[PDB]
Amino acid sequence: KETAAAKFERQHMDSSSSSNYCNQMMKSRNLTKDRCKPVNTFVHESLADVQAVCSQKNVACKNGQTNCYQSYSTMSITDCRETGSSKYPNCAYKTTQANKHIIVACEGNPYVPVHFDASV
Known part of the structure; x- marks a missing residue:
């Protein structure tokens, strides 16, 4: 079974944009298999920097657990x-860059990290 940490890295880490960035990434990370994952965030900082968030600002998670951390x-x-007109299997996404x-x-x-709760 893929660990939660590994799933987080697969779904949300891209430490390495084109308007097509999301289309290609969502495909390459297996997020368009079976369904179009509608919303996703990729983080472009080093894995070390993201893992360090687990030592930063403790906040409540959306689900009410207390193991969430804000960078x-x-x-x-x-x-x-996913665009309003995206139709599996031709998953189409709008790519938006941000600093949050x-x-x-x-x-x-x-x-x-084992789950991406939000960007703020």
Whole structure:
């Protein structure tokens, strides 16, 4: 079973944009298999910097758990949002670049992000 941490890296880490960035990324990260994942965020900071968020500002998660953390600094991210006319299997996304604080849920040993809660 893919760990939650590994799933977080697959769905949300791209440390490495074109208007087609989201179309290609959502495909390459297996987020267009079976369904078009409607909304997704990729974070372009180093894995180390994102993992460090687990030592930054403790905040409540959307689901009410208390293991969420807001990055002290803004981070370079890309929001991928499925277009109003996107129809599986031809998943189409609008790519929007931004610099925002990220909120992630952290868990496990090592204590790392396991869920992307929001950008603010």
